[PDB]
Write a protein that binds this ligand. Structure first.
Ligand SMILES: CCCCCCCCCCCCCCCCCC(=O)OC[C@H](CO[C@@H]1O[C@H](CO[C@H]2O[C@H](CO)[C@H](O)[C@H](O)[C@H]2O)[C@H](O)[C@H](O)[C@H]1O)OC(=O)CCCCCCCCCCCCCCCCC
Ligand code: CLA
Ligand code: CLA
Ligand SMILES: C=Cc1c(C)c2cc3nc(c4c5[nH]c(cc6nc(cc1[nH]2)C(C)=C6CC)c(C)c5C(=O)[C@@H]4C(=O)OC)[C@@H](CCC(=O)OC/C=C(\C)CCC[C@H](C)CCC[C@H](C)CCCC(C)C)[C@@H]3C
Ligand SMILES: CC(C)=CCC/C(C)=C/CC/C(C)=C\CC/C(C)=C/CC/C(C)=C/CC/C(C)=C/CC/C(C)=C/CC/C(C)=C\CC/C(C)=C/CC1=CC(=O)C(C)=C(C)C1=O
Ligand SMILES: CCCCCCCCCCCCCCCCCC(=O)OC[C@H](CO[C@@H]1O[C@H](CO)[C@H](O)[C@H](O)[C@H]1O)OC(=O)CCCCCCCCCCCCCCCCC
Ligand SMILES: CCCCCCCCCCCCCCCCCC(=O)OC[C@H](CO[C@@H]1O[C@H](CO)[C@H](O)[C@H](O)[C@H]1O)OC(=O)CCCCCCCCCCCCCCCCC
Ligand SMILES: CCCCCCCCCCCCCCCC(=O)OC[C@H](CO[C@@H]1O[C@H](CS(=O)(=O)O)[C@@H](O)[C@H](O)[C@H]1O)OC(=O)CCCCCCCCCCCCCCC
Ligand SMILES: CCCCCCCCCCCCCCCC(=O)OC[C@H](COP(=O)(O)OC[C@@H](O)CO)OC(=O)CCCCCCCCCCCCCCC
Ligand SMILES: CC1=C(/C=C/C(C)=C/C=C/C(C)=C/C=C/C=C(C)/C=C/C=C(C)/C=C/C2=C(C)CCCC2(C)C)C(C)(C)CCC1
Ligand SMILES: CCCCCCCCCCCCCCCCCC(=O)O
Ligand SMILES: CCCCCCCCCCCCCCCCCC(=O)O
Ligand code: OEY
Ligand SMILES: [Cl-]
Ligand SMILES: [Cl-]
Ligand SMILES: [Fe+2]
Lengths: 38, 30, 32, 36, 34, 65, 36, 341, 82, 34, 334, 36, 33, 37, 30
């Protein structure tokens, strides 16, 4: 069944996803605002 | 060690035969 | 078999040294 | 702009380090880690 | 517990004070981004 | 170059050098598979490491009987 | 051993004299630019 | 002109600190590795894993603080915060050694990020990637010593702890238990590091003492312009000097600088190999011929047998306190000791 | 030879810089001071205080000996002081 | 006209802020007695 | 054109394949003496009573050593700092038992190497170079004096100088750590920073220059053939190297002046090795590394071990074992 | 000042094969006596 | 001393075989020029 | 059938010879003690 | 035999020093 460590695994998985998705979310936003002029 | 040494020398000679026949200096009419 | 243990090195060098000599002379002939 | 002269910034900053570092060396002889 | 607010107060006050003193010029900056 | 019978049979398998699908093609799909495989390898590692403990999975020699 | 001692005393004195008199023989002048 | 290219644009802007795609991996991991080490050395104990104090808070100084390895009972556990050992409790995680794996793994991924950064910048500027390649050596050392080594032993407990003194203890451990000085892979490393340092000093001094007079000042630094095409020192006079002093000299500037890359990079790679062996206790501990003779002939003595007595003292005198999980109790009467001392 | 950020030399000689930072620096310093002087650091990190490395008549190290009960072990040692 | 907030500003304060905080904590520690 | 002036001119000639010079007039015989005695001793010398306890240590190949274990063994503790030339022994047999060859080798070698340094000055002067390469070599030279002369002076005996051997070197550094704790001494810590940083900057400089070689060759040839001995033009682009390294870090942590760069290369390892040679030369007078043994104690007074105490346990093991038959009294005061 | 008496030396492929054969067959002959 | 008898042939081929390799390449380089 | 166009001469200059022989000899000097053990 | 081997390699290195110094390829300007 769904043991304590498998629960921890999912916690770690979602926390990583939040960190990466939040990071990339912020990086895309900034790059959209502050573009380079060609 | 001695069996291996005899077989190794013999095997080198057999390889030499191969090269001496198939990768010889070709004789050409000069 | 209770053979002489310097037999191995004596046979190896008997093959290697003169063989290498010939290989040296042959390769430098081809490149000239 | 360039109001505070840099030599004054760097003297005060410098004495600031001398002080915290001196505090760390005093603490080697007092309190925890002093052997006493 | 209370010791956390004690610790965090100088940080919040200092961050407040820098906000107060820089806000005007930080608005100029954001506007220039188109 | 020398033509041979086997060569002529195999020919079309070596005839599309340099052909690409346009732009990003299936790159988004590739990334999905990569991410699943990472999770899959995390699980396998953490099982071996005993960081992930699962019911009925005794990571020991004593699992041979 | 006394013979060995004497020999080494003489050999060392020889080389040290060469060194001292060699550097006294106008050594600053022995360069490629300005000589004196 | 979609979001990927736009983000690429922004990552690769010329700014005071270049970011790049490699920065997404490098900057978080480098900063966390660093922050974990400063946090742990300032506040965190080693009491429950080691029976040691190890933080400024506890009374330690810069030389004796460390982030210490986890307890031997953790094995090779990743020791994730949310893992089954600490169960999400930050405090217990700290007390159990979690900061050690945190620093080591984030440091590992930071090293990858840095070498990717070297690749990324070199590609954007148009130079060859030899700086990245040179950095493989510190990578090999890090992973072999901090990861491979404790992975072959019983646990992370026996990896280096992150501290000045704790590394000193690592060196001494390796002498007494592994006889690491006798290992030809270390010896090659030594030659490579000492040889690199020698090359560094001898090349800098040769250049500085074969300069061309290119200005009138007594401070010869000002007479160099980064865009001049002309060599600033005389290879020819340097070559003559060294030929007459040493017998041989460099004559090829490219070979010279490649050799400077090669020597220390190779030395570090060699030592990494030896440490891999010591992961398995595959030591160069003994010379069998010497031991057979010495066993039979009590008047045979060499500097090799003298150093093994030193090792035997190191092991017996440091094991109980250095390996507290083993519960070694050595009564006075079994400690090896020479006369009087 | 510039990428457009403001030179540091120009910033730290400026009056506005020092109007903000003569506040923000002592504030951060005193914050760290209180983190320790209040005892909070001990509690956050689990670091023993000078009176809590050993129980009064104990000279054994409270060494963790189990991987999966390690947490409970530390908690048991701590209770042997309370 | 220089911008105030930049990637550089973040990198600088990412290191500077905890540095001063740790310095304050380590200073307090010199007065701890056993 | 007199006999002396001709001789002087040959001694200082810049046409000699190897420069002689006045420093060379001393260097050549002393190095030949040291070298010839070292090779013979290493191969065939009999065991030497290094610690003066009639416990001879075998150092040569014919008496059962290999390359790693062999050494020329230091002279007997019974001699201490007394001068023991050959002619002071009743026989060569005696001189060999008591360790005479060590003294002959190290004194000739230190003389010869000091002259080596001066000879580097001298030739620089004859070639119209700047003079200070010899100052870079003073760092290794100082280090050799420290382990062969200064440390034996302070401790009272050449029997505690470094053996001329590979395993003997290790014995020396282990016993040094037990009696001094060189590792906790800041001058050794600076020596490590000097040689680690030296290796680092060696790799850096080599890789940056190698990274920025100007394309002068095809891929079928060594790029080294793109440089010709004596060409006037630089062979790499320092602005490209600086443009790479200043972005790797930030702009102002990278050199754009090649002279400052190469001075830095010279200075860092030289200065670090000066300090480490001075570390050995001052631990010669027993001003040892930091002692934090039992520095941390708890409210009650229990000792709370740190990694320094663990170091101390290892040092104790080296202390109680070394020269195991040589101490009769409780303190190893030298 | 080059010496005018130097000459190139040659060994053609057939001579390599002949020599290598001689050497291997000699070794095959004598090796039994070397091991004895 | 009771050393490994095969250490001798090990050492001999370790020296001989790569050295011969280099000499072969060197000599045929000279005879091009 | 044409001869192979990809063939190339190989070179080892005298300095590389000296550097390689030194490498080999010093390595043998280093490892020989361990082979004899 | 081990002694002979050690000394042989050492002597080959000394011999190499001699050729490397006196029979080097001469450096030639441009
Ligand atoms: C170069 C470029 C560098 C780039 C690297 C970037 C960093 C990437 C991060 C890598 C993280 C590595 C984590 C590996 C953890 C590990 O191994 O953890 C170890 C675990 C195995 O766990 C160990 O297992 C041991 C043996 O157990 C077994 O034996 C016991 C005795 O009978 C009992 O029966 C027990 O039940 C049974 O399971 C002990 O129990 C140890 O305490 C326990 O830690 O392996 C596992 O997780 C997985 C093991 C299989 C995978 C092997 C990959 C490991 C790579 C290193 C290989 C070299 C190994 C060194 C050899 C030299
Ligand atoms: C590039 C940045 C980076 C990288 C590479 C790492 C890497 C690591 N961290 Mg670190 N970390 C980072 C940034 C990073 N961290 C940041 C910014 C912080 C501050 C928040 C931390 C804080 C932190 C802590 C506190 C800890 C780590 C730990 C770890 C290790 C385990 C990571 C793990 O298991 O992830 C698992 C997760 C992933 C790999 C993410 C996979 C993404 C999947 C595919 C997406 C899944 C889809 C989603 C869930 C679906 C939604 C469903 C929903 C609707 C229900 C590893 C060495 C641990 C450690 O060091 O242990 C010693 C630990 O305890 N990290
Ligand atoms: C003459 C003396 C001498 C010399 C020159 C060396 C030289 C060496 N030793 Mg040996 N050693 C010696 C004596 C000596 N040793 C003795 C007597 C002993 C006792 C047995 C030892 C025991 C010993 C051990 C036990 C080990 C070595 C190792 C090494 C290598 C270290 C390589 C290195 O740079 O690691 C430095 C580390 C790295 C390069 C790793 C990556 C570092 C990254 C880039 C760090 C980035 C820092 C980052 C910016 C943050 C810093 C911030 C913070 C500090 C403020 C090197 C070959 C190691 C080895 O062989 O490794 C394979 C090793 O583990 N030595
Ligand atoms: C102790 C010795 C040592 C140190 C400290 C060191 C340090 C460094 N070398 C670097 C580079 C190099 N090193 C090179 C060759 C060498 N480096 C050597 C030895 C070392 N190199 C040697 C001997 C060589 C010769 C082969 C090259 C060729 C380079 C570079 O190109 C590069 C550079 O730019 O130099 C100027 C820099 C990489 C910065 C980085 O990764 O940022 C990112 C930071 C990260 C990823 C954090 C990693 C954290 C580590 C791995 C774990 C935690 C460490 C703790 C925080 C501190 C612990 C301290 C206690 C143990 C006392 C850094 C300054
Ligand atoms: C709860 C929550 C959410 C938590 C918050 C956590 C959080 C979210 C974290 C995310 C962090 C974040 C957003 C990112 C920003 C973080 C950031 C700023 C990270 C900092 C990382 C960091 C530690 C970086 C490492 C710095 C580093 C080690 C560099 C130090 C400088 C250094 C030692 C440089 C060496 C310079 C030197 C001595 C000379 C070079 C050597 C040498 C002589 C070279 C030779 C040489 C040089 C030349 O020049 C040229 C020309 C040539 C020829 C040549 O030979
Ligand atoms: C832009 C901003 C960038 C921010 C910079 C951040 C970089 C990270 C900081 C790394 C520096 C690490 C130094 C910490 C020293 C410290 O805190 O000591 C803090 C300790 C505190 O002092 C200890 O306090 C204890 C309190 O219980 C006890 O009283 C102890 O007796 C007492 O020793 O001080 C020292 O140990 C002695 C002070 C002098 C130490 C100097 C060490 C630095 C010199 C080493 C070489 C430099 C190291 C860098 C190279 C590696
Ligand atoms: C032609 C080229 C070959 C010549 C090159 C030079 C040869 C080098 C030989 C090196 C090995 C010599 C060791 C001494 C062995 C010997 O004397 O005993 C000979 C030993 C065998 O051992 C013999 O065994 C006998 C019973 O069978 C008896 O016990 C003998 O006493 C015992 O000596 O030979 C080996 O086992 C050699 C094979 C081992 C190879 C696998 C090791 C893999 C290690 C990984 C290495 C990677 C490192 C890469 C580095 C980068
Ligand atoms: C639990 C998870 C924790 C992790 C959370 C994830 C979020 C972390 C993301 C960090 C990214 C930081 C980007 C900072 C950019 C910024 O603040 O200034 C950008 C703004 C404007 O700055 C501008 O500065 C520019 C130069 S530069 O880009 O800053 O170099 C200039 O172009 C422009 O004109 C000027 O206005
Ligand atoms: C004071 C009296 C004179 C002292 C005698 C000195 C003898 C030693 C000199 C070395 C000769 C051998 C070098 C040959 C090799 C040789 O001829 O190299 C010559 C080579 C010349 O380089 P160039 O730039 O001309 O050539 C490069 C191009 O050809 C590219 O292919 O120099 C080097 O590469 C420098 C680095 C050599 C670094 C090694 C030197 C130190 C090695 C010490 C070895 C010690 C082992 C000891 C074992 C016991
Ligand atoms: C771990 C962790 C984390 C992170 C953290 C961090 C990020 C931190 C950082 C931190 C920091 C970042 C810190 C810092 C500190 C610093 C210091 C403490 C400093 C000091 C300094 C010094 C002391 C110096 C001095 C000097 C000298 C001595 C000489 C010269 C001058 C000078 C001044 C330099 C988290 C949260 C995620 C969670 C998990 C865990
Ligand atoms: C740097 C300045 C150092 C400050 C001196 C600290 C010395 C205190 C010693 C003591 O407490 O007796
Ligand atoms: C792929 C990159 C991964 C990046 C971040 C991964 C780690 C982020 C840290 C988040 C962990 C903190 C929350 C988990 C705390 C555990 C609490 C609990 O177990 O209930
Ligand atoms: O360290 Mn310990 O201390 Ca200087 O002496 Mn007393 O013993 Mn002995 O001879 Mn060599 O060594
Ligand atoms: Cl001893
Ligand atoms: Cl005594
Ligand atoms: Fe250079």
């Amino acid at each position: 069944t769904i043991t304590p460590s498998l629960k921890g695994f999912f916690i770690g998985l979602l926390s990583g996803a939040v960190v990466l998705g939040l990071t990339f979310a912020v990086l895309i936003a900034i790059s959209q605002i502050d573009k380079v002029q060609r | 060690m001695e069996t291996i040494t005899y077989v190794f020398i013999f095997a080198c000679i057999i390889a030499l035969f191969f090269f001496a026949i198939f990768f010889r200096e070709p004789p050409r009419i000069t | 078999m209770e053979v002489n243990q310097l037999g191995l090195i004596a046979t190896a060098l008997f093959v290697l040294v003169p063989s290498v000599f010939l290989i040296i002379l042959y390769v430098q002939t081809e490149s000239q | 702009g360039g109001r505070i002269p840099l030599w004054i910034v760097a003297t005060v900053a410098g004495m600031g380090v001398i002080v915290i570092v001196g505090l760390f060396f005093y603490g080697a002889y007092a309190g925890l880690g002093s052997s006493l | 517990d209370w010791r956390v607010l004690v610790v965090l107060l100088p940080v919040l006050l200092a961050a407040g004070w820098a906000v107060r003193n820089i806000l005007p010029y930080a608005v100029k900056q954001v506007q220039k981004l188109l | 170059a020398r033509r041979t019978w086997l060569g002529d049979i195999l020919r079309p398998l070596n005839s599309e050098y340099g052909k690409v699908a346009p732009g990003w093609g299936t790159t988004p799909l590739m990334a999905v598979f990569m991410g699943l495989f990472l999770v899959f390898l995390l699980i396998i590692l953490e099982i071996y490491n005993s960081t992930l403990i699962l019911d009925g999975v005794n990571v020991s020699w004593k699992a041979l009987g | 051993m006394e013979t060995l001692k004497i020999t080494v005393y003489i050999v060392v004195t020889f080389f040290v004299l060469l060194f001292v008199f060699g550097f006294l023989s106008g050594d600053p002048a022995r360069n490629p630019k300005r000589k004196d | 002109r979609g979001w990927f290219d736009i983000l690429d644009d922004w990552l690769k802007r010329d700014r005071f600190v270049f970011v790049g795609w490699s920065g997404i991996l490098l900057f978080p991991c480098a900063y966390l590795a660093l922050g974990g080490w400063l946090t742990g050395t300032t506040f965190v104990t080693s009491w429950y894993t080691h029976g040691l104090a190890s933080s400024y808070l506890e009374g330690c100084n810069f030389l004796t603080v460390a982030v210490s390895t986890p307890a031997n009972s953790m094995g090779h556990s990743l020791l994730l915060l949310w893992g089954p050992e600490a169960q999400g409790d930050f405090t217990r995680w700290c007390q159990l050694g979690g900061l050690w794996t945190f620093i080591a793994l984030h440091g590992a991924f930071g090293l990858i990020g840095f070498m990717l950064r070297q690749f990324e910048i070199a590609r954007l500027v148009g130079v060859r990637p030899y700086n990245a390649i040179a950095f493989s050596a510190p990578i090999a050392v890090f992973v072999s010593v901090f990861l491979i080594y404790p992975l072959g032993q019983s646990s992370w407990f026996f990896a280096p702890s992150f501290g000045v003194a704790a590394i000193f203890r690592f060196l001494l451990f390796f002498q007494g238990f592994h006889n690491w000085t006798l290992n030809p892979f270390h010896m090659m490393g030594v030659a490579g590091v000492l040889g690199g340092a020698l090359l560094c000093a001898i090349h800098g001094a040769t250049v500085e003492n074969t300069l061309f007079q290119d200005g009138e000042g007594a401070s010869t630094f000002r007479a160099f312009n980064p865009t001049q095409a002309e060599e600033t020192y005389s290879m020819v006079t340097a070559n003559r000097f060294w030929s007459q002093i040493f017998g041989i000299a460099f004559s090829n500037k490219r070979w010279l600088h490649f050799f400077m890359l090669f020597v220390p990079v190779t030395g570090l790679w060699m030592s990494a190999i030896g440490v891999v062996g010591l992961a398995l206790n595959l030591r160069s501990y003994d010379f069998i011929s010497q031991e057979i003779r010495a066993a039979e002939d009590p008047e045979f003595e060499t500097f090799y047998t003298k150093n093994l007595l030193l090792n035997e003292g190191i092991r017996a005198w440091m094991a109980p306190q250095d390996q507290p999980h083993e519960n070694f109790v050595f009564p006075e009467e079994v400690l090896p000791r020479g006369n009087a001392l | 030879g510039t990428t457009g950020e403001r030179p540091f030399s120009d910033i730290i000689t400026s009056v506005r810089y020092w109007v903000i930072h003569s506040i923000t620096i002592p504030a951060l310093f005193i914050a760290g001071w209180l983190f320790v002087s209040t005892g909070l650091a001990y509690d956050v990190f689990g670091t023993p205080r000078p009176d809590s490395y050993y129980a009064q008549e104990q000279r054994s190290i409270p060494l963790v000996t189990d991987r999966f009960e390690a947490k409970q072990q530390v908690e048991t040692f701590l209770e042997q002081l309370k | 006209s220089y911008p105030i907030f930049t990637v550089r500003w973040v990198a600088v304060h990412t290191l500077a802020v905890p540095t001063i905080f740790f310095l304050g904590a380590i200073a307090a520690m010199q007065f701890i007695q056993r | 054109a007199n006999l002396w002036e001709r001789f002087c001119n040959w001694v200082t000639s810049t046409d000699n394949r190897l420069y002689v010079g006045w420093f060379g007039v001393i260097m050549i015989p002393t190095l030949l003496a040291a070298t010839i005695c070292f090779v013979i001793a290493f191969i065939a010398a009999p065991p030497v009573d290094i610690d003066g306890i009639r416990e001879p240590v075998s150092g040569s190949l014919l008496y059962g050593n290999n390359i790693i274990t062999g050494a020329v063994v230091p002279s007997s503790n019974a001699i201490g700092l007394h001068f023991y030339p050959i002619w002071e022994a009743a026989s060569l047999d005696e001189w060999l038992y008591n360790g005479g060859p060590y003294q002959l080798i190290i004194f000739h070698f230190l003389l010869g190497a000091s002259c080596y340094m001066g000879r580097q000055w001298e030739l620089s002067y004859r070639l119209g170079m700047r003079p200070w390469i010899c100052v870079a070599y003073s760092a290794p030279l100082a280090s050799a004096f420290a382990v062969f002369l200064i440390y034996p002076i302070g401790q009272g005996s050449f029997s505690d100088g470094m053996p001329l051997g590979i395993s003997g070197t290790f014995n020396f550094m282990i016993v040094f750590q037990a009696e001094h704790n060189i590792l906790m001494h800041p001058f050794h810590q600076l020596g490590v920073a000097g040689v680690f940083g030296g290796a680092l900057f060696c790799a850096m400089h080599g890789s940056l220059v190698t990274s920025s070689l100007i394309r002068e060759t095809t891929e079928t040839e060594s790029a080294n053939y793109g440089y010709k001995f004596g060409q006037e033009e630089e062979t790499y682009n320092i602005v490209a190297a600086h443009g790479y390294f200043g972005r790797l870090i930030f702009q102002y942590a990278s050199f754009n002046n090649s002279r400052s760069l190469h001075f830095f290369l010279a200075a860092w390892p030289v200065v670090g090795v000066w300090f480490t040679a001075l570390g050995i030369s001052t631990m010669a007078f027993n001003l040892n590394g930091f002692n934090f043994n039992h520095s941390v104690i708890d409210a009650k007074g229990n000792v709370i071990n740190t990694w320094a105490d663990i170091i101390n346990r290892a040092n104790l093991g080296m202390e109680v074992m070394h020269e195991r038959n040589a101490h009769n009294f409780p303190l190893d005061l030298a | 000042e080059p010496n005018p008496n130097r000459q190139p030396v040659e060994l053609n492929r057939t001579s390599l094969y002949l020599g290598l054969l001689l050497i291997l067959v000699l070794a095959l002959l004598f090796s039994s006596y070397f091991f004895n």
